[PDB]
Symmetry: D2
Subunit: 291 residues, 4 copies
Amino acid sequence: RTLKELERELQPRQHLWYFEYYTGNNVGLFMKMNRVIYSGQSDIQRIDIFENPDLGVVFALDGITMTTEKDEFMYHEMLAHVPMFLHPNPKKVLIIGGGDGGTLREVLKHDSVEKAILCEVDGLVIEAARKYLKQTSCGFDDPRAEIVIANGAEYVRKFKNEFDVIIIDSTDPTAHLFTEEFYQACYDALKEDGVFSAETEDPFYDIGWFKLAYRRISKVFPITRVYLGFMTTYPSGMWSYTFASKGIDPIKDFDPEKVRKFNKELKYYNEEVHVASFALPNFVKKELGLM
Amino acid sequence: LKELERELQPRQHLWYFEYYTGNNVGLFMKMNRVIYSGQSDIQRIDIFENPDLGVVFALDGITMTTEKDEFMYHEMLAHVPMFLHPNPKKVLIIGGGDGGTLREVLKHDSVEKAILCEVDGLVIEAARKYLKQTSCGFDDPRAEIVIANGAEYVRKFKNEFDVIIIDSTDPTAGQGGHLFTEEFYQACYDALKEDGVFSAETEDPFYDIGWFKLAYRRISKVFPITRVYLGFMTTYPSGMWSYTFASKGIDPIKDFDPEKVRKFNKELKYYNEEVHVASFALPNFVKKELGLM
Amino acid sequence: RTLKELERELQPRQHLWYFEYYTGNNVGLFMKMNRVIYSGQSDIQRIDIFENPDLGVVFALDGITMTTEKDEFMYHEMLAHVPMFLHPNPKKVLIIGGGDGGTLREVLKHDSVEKAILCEVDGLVIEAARKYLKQTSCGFDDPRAEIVIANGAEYVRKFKNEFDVIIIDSLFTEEFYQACYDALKEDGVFSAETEDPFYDIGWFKLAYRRISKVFPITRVYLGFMTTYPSGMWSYTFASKGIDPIKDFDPEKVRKFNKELKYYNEEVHVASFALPNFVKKELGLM
Amino acid sequence: LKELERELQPRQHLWYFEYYTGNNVGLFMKMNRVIYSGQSDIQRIDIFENPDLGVVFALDGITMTTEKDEFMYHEMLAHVPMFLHPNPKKVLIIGGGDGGTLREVLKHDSVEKAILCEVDGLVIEAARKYLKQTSCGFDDPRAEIVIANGAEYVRKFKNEFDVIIIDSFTEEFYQACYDALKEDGVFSAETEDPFYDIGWFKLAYRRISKVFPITRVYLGFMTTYPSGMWSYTFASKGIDPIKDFDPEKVRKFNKELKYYNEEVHVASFALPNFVKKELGLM
């Protein structure tokens, strides 16, 4: 009998583990690994893709959990649909980061989209996602999608009055995608009625960055509003996103009917959740100075 | 010893590992020191210090409270039903031996009597000595601590309470626990007055989706008004916690008066008027699981 | 570009770990994993082969460490060379277990060997070793080596007065040991790994008792094993007359024409010196 | 609380992780209970209970002693040089705050005075209160416990000790030990595992051999130390570890020995080829 002929379904045991340390290295999440699908190193970072019995395929960058098959929909739907539904007719979209493709997948559900550019700094992330993260990279081959390997901060400044929507995802490191000038470049790249959303992390372990991102975005966009969503495998489980625009109000200019009549599948986002996500608990309001 | 001792600094050698349902995922926390470890005839108690979370209280290896974030859980479990009741004077809290829910309930000036029914006396004694942030209301003149099984205790009353809150109880028993039966919920209904309200922690709709569904289903078979609300809980499994509000007529949205919250004379670190209403907005996957799509 | 074109040398971090529990499940060893080379499941057990920054390639069966590139020589040399050098002229050797091939590799270093049979119960272990554990499986290609996929306890019973040396690299009953005795020639020798007299004291004592009831000469020897539970490994030498000390000719070792990274004439004799606690467990002193 | 407390039973939630040099491999242990956690101006002390190993003592996350096997280390470090000396009366032990080595040294009736020099006073006090198995010799009239830096302390003596044991590294320090010893004095020092700590092992041997005319490495099993293969370095001004060893002294020993014996003494000096190669002896 040959090697392949002798192989059987791999059963999970209690010897292989993935440890994700949170900011501060005092708390973290651990996951059992049934098998490791891919481990690669680029000039930028390390990529690991493995299988967990409960969460399915897990994608991590430098030991930080990026996506989980069981719950990535929670994150991608909130990051993408809030600004997409708020825009009156989103045709040209720019997504910075999001090498896994999840945000692109959600953006492509909107029929108005004519072109969606996915700007990823690491080519190895795109190649690994295309081969091993099928659930999220399914939009890579869509004719409306254009994948560009570049630093988002450098790429966005090449455009002026070009995009309807700009979304900043979390897969791209920079030790650049969070400076006031970067947000100003995003503002300038957007059209007069353009909208924006950026993942702004957990107001718990990453409170310092959360406050900094809000402050910087607010210095550029007249409308800057934080919204929250559950993210069952991200640090603390309380994730924040920051919606921004040149005038469109996330509550006052929201049309629930657009969501109710939507012709695509949504596993998290809905009209009540859109409005509810903008309600901030007292401790978050205090951190942002919103009383 | 004492003369040679200095401030204890954390290293990378002591850890607390918490396993979630299914045992495939969990949370780990660094321990600067173990404050107390005790074993009762019911369960094991461990209280330790984490550099970021502060004092952590665990029962049988399950995180119950953390100093840094317990307010998120206790405020949502207590304030939703308390603010919805017209004039809550008599309140019964089952479980929650740490005292957090009692502390929040006592913030309401209308309260004349609040009973905390805890099954394990060792939890109460440990909370007094080591969990002062949550046990601060134990000695309030309006408070009464009773050491008994909640399912048996509640049956002794009829048309007695304005509010009944079911906090954490027997976490290792899961959905098969005594405080998750239709009989128990019916006893709660019977112990409540004609216009009484109720709230119960109903787990995370992720790792414990089945338990969550069972609790909602059984509560809904007893109370005419049953509504799930959600809240962040930064150190509980998945971070997405659910609670179930129930009543004999009072609607959590139609009968909510934001002015009661705006004019509240006590500190609130999580709960507010907007959060109250927002907590009842359920994501699609939750609605589908409850048959509300 | 393509995947391979963008790939660089993989650097270890603090997120991937292998945890091995010792008997009792109260103590264990953990290792950082730079990458996992192979994970497979047979009808018998699970195989995992991964890379550790300090130990190199590590091979584990059901979460139990079997071999590491950095120190496997310590175990394989002590298990094989003690009985091999003690035999007057070892020509036919039977190895039960040892699917990684390390013991076979050491046995083949002896020029007198004409045939060495490696009897492994799991064919997938042999295939994985051939493909991923070249350091230990290099002997698979030797014309004198014969790999047999079979249950060792059932296999050895098919032979009588056949082998010069029998090595147990893994199969614990007195009946099994008697079968080994019967399969050996009149002047045959035997060795078996008998675990650590610490976490596995129970098995250690049982193995010694059963082997000693069958063989006239039964002596325990010890060796360092830097990645096995406790680091104190025991082996049991047995024969039908050959004494491991009195009949040892150090010149055979001194003049050996092959590389030895652990075993030598001084270590051979020294390995038979047992600490008091071990002697007490065996009922010696 | 007192009336409600019961026997504390172990679970799978409290753990001790000990990282080995390099931080790529380590040992983990279940902790049923933590007995003591303290911090001195020098280091952190942790004493806890493991279901299989019993009481475990760690310094800065490094395992120092285990109730189940500490005898292996303490007996090999102390008895090899003690039995090799003709009549050991004055002994100096540098380090070993737990007291295990002192306990073993005191078993020899010939000892009149044994000085235990520990740098951290908190270790001595913690050992006296929580590590009774090893600190049992603290009150012996022949024992003298001093709190000081061993490197500076040994310099106060010249031609004073019969035996010097290092239970804890410059050529200058080893020369001071040589000078503190009498004309026929013996020496022993723990020299780590020739695996994860190969660098330290080689350095210690080189430095000791440059001072003492007779320097020989011996090995011993240590079931809870990194790799399980522990080395010790014997040194003297003429006494040979093998040639001058009298097995009768060990056979007639009127005290308990759980590891050390006459055959083990001789066997411990047999070094595997890889160790000989690292020491330049091959």
